[PDB]
Amino acid sequence: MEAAHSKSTEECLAYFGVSETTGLTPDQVKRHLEKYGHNELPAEEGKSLWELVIEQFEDLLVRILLLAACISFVLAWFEEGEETITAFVEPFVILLILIANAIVGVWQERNAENAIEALKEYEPEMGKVYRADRKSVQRIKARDIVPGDIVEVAVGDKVPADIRILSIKSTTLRVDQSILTGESVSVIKHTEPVPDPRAVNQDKKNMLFSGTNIAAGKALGIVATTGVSTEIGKIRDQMAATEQDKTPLQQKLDEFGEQLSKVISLICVAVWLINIGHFNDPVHGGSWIRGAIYYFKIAVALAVAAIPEGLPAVITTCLALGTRRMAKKNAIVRSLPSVETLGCTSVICSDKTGTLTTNQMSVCKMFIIDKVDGDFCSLNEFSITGSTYAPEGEVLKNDKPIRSGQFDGLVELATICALCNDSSLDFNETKGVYEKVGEATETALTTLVEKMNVFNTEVRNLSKVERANACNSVIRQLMKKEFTLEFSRDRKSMSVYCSPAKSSRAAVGNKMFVKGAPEGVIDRCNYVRVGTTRVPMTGPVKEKILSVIKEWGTGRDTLRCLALATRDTPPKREEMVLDDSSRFMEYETDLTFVGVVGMLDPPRKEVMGSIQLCRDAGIRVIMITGDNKGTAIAICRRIGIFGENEEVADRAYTGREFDDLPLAEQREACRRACCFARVEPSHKSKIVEYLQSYDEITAMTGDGVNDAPALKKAEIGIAMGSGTAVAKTASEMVLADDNFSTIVAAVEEGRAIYNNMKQFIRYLISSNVGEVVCIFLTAALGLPEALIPVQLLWVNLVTDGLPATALGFNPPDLDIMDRPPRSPKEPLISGWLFFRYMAIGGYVGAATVGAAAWWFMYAEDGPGVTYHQLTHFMQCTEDHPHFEGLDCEIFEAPEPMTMALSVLVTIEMCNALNSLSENQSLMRMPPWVNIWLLGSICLSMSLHFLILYVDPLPMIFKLKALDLTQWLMVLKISLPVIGLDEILKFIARNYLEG
Ligand SMILES: C/C=C(/C)C(=O)O[C@H]1C(C)=C2[C@H]([C@@H]1OC(=O)CCCCCCC)[C@@](C)(OC(C)=O)C[C@H](OC(=O)CCC)[C@@]1(O)[C@H]2OC(=O)[C@@]1(C)O
Ligand SMILES: [K+]
Ligand SMILES: [Mg+2]
């Protein structure tokens, strides 16, 4: 029964055909179970260990690599491991990488945490029902509860289903429902219907929501909805229906892999068509099986050359280290790839209280009526110092300090503040500061009362722990608080009914003290207090009171205002019914205005600057607040979201205004809006959707489980460190200190990170371009393998992987927050840069094949063949008494492969430095600029020598070291690559726009 809050207790009982005394019959439970299912959210999504690894191998590059391993493996068993038992080495290495990458997947997944699963923490194991088969109450499993059940809850109970309250057995029922409504304090429940079928949850005063807690009391209810139909259930389903898109880099890599298969596929065909002459060859006289093995030794080399096998390790280690750095700056990143999206944020939607502001409220201003005499009216306005909750401060009139007691209107103002107040103070000895007990707003009032000391209590001789509530306590001993009419939002006030306590001075009698939003309260005043006198409420006095309130709330003060008032002749006690807040407005009529208080919830100190950084970085900032629209706007002005004199008619909206627009104009509103006041959790999600319709990258804050769907949906959901576990698990990032400026500092890192990622991605991939060239020339010409997969893998995982991660530590651009957000569709390599790596790749694939061949042709220690057809090396076995007077195993020699492997290594070290900066020459941007980069390069070079010199490894790698001179040639060949990009860098700077 979705609409139970709007129905009476009788109607709900009749809807289900259940007695409040008996509960459901066993039959009814049977039938209700079948119709409505069990009371629980669905079991976790479907992914198993066997399934996990299949997903690890859906990847296109991973798929190609796997295949490569197989061909490698055949080559092993069908080539003599008796000539070289270092042949079964190649197929093995490949497989291993694939295992690591799949183990990466399962460790990451098994340690991941689903937000929908965090919801289930709000499901109690048990619940209590009355059912017909037994007279006394039954403790049963909560999942066995069914709609129509007569349920019982009490102090400490987590509420098992969405329940329409029937009967409150205790004198009062208080509920902690902060997780659903973000109401900080426990709230009173009642039993009467709530008229509006479209009432938001905060106004369903007669409902208990599944997952919340009973803070006090005891009550009997009827279950309205269960399982997926509850409020927390609807939230689960929104989340589950939310597909989170791939990060831009993820997309670009899938793009790469897609295209990389296509290219590789093309290259294979290419190979075979300059070697199409193999068809004009005689059927007999050729070892085909050696020719076919040749196109497969080259096939596996190709797959290995093209794939940046070390890239996922480098990407993840840079993000990891960025993350550690972010966490020292209060930004706790939950999703490693989020760092990139974070740097892309173009819109930040942020809650105000506690993140743009301190949520540390104090009363800064107050006024009472000084005099009313015709059209003449005079106020007494005061100011109050001290911004903390401490009793430290003074009251000032026209900047002069005054004694509050001297003003009759103020002793009454204080007593209203002291009594119309469910909050208090307490002094903490551990932290050494005063702290709030209750709402921030009301606690500001009890602080105000302490500063006013309106009876001049011997306060000087008072200790701190008792100083906290000292002045308040002498007011609480003057009137007896009989009962209180709790705040509700239909009337936006609350009141307390007091009788005179024992009085030495016989009072007028009972009083009601009320405080609330000024408009409503003031309208219900027929009198204004002037000192101890009372005068009828007139126009000039009203306008004067309201004009000041507007000033304080709407100007640079940005103060939240409460009107304070008392009812001098309340209804007779016996004529009041306290079980239905519907009547409380009527009880709070015919009041006398006594004063207004203005309190401030100040911006965090850093928030000013951050809003300006966002302006500088072209990031829109959207405030979401509970303030009225006029004060929301003013607060925006105060923190720089709006200029002080900027016209913001079309950039500010209330939930009410926003809903009243047709869908088209809701969307246009989101294009420019920077302030939403008094919204519904509904709206956060809608706002995100709209912003995504402008292809925005939206960060969005939240902290309750009611925020969870918007967090899930935003590109970056941002949770509060002090918020719910559920909100955190739905977020890409948690703010350890709740501070908005932490968002902005994380966006900065995200940009710095990605820029450095750009460089080592560009670098590794450009190397793979190169390798693919070498492998291509090997096959295209018909040379002995210049490079082997065993070697190429080593280069791609290790020797290039260290400068790659070193480029992760490229110092950041100083203007990195003076540029607009990066387009998510920005290609990593395109246009002109494409040409640059097109050229560099063409170089290294020639350098590597060259040195290998230079060992063969134009040789000092090689066959020394000057310009011979050592492209026909394969047919040297039978054709040696035909052509060669020389040997033939010289074509499987290590030294050519290690000439190639050495020029590859040396080249990439140089190209790492060309990669320190995209276009800045090492003229203006030296290589010492990256401290760690120069360091890492020297380490890989060691590792080069290690596979050249340490007794086990050379045979494994088909390598043999080269003496004092053969390196000169390695350097002759490989060193120039610097001069190439240094030129192409010069070009971009001076000729194309940039
Ligand atoms: C890695 C090895 C190379 C050989 C490769 O195939 O990558 C290609 C391809 C996949 C693209 C190209 C490569 O194409 C070429 O290199 C031209 C053909 C040369 C053939 C080689 C032998 C004849 C990238 C590598 O070329 C340059 C010149 O660097 C740049 C870029 O890659 C990126 O932007 C990096 C993405 C993380 C992509 O054009 C990319 O596809 C597009 O979707 C992008 C945007 O991805
Ligand atoms: K999200
Ligand atoms: Mg919230």
Short mmCIF file of C-alpha atoms and ligand atoms in Angstrom, two decimals, residues 244 710-717 730-732, ligand 2:
data_model
loop_
_atom_site.label_atom_id
_atom_site.label_comp_id
_atom_site.label_asym_id
_atom_site.label_seq_id
_atom_site.Cartn_x
_atom_site.Cartn_y
_atom_site.Cartn_z
CA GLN A 244 28.01 3.86 -14.94
CA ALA A 710 22.43 10.77 -7.43
CA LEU A 711 25.95 9.75 -6.34
CA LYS A 712 25.76 6.59 -8.40
CA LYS A 713 24.54 8.59 -11.40
CA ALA A 714 26.96 11.54 -11.33
CA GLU A 715 30.27 11.07 -13.22
CA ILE A 716 31.96 11.63 -9.85
CA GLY A 717 29.85 11.00 -6.78
CA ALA A 730 28.18 4.76 -3.89
CA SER A 731 30.90 7.37 -4.33
CA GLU A 732 34.04 7.58 -6.44
K K B 2 28.98 7.85 -9.92
#
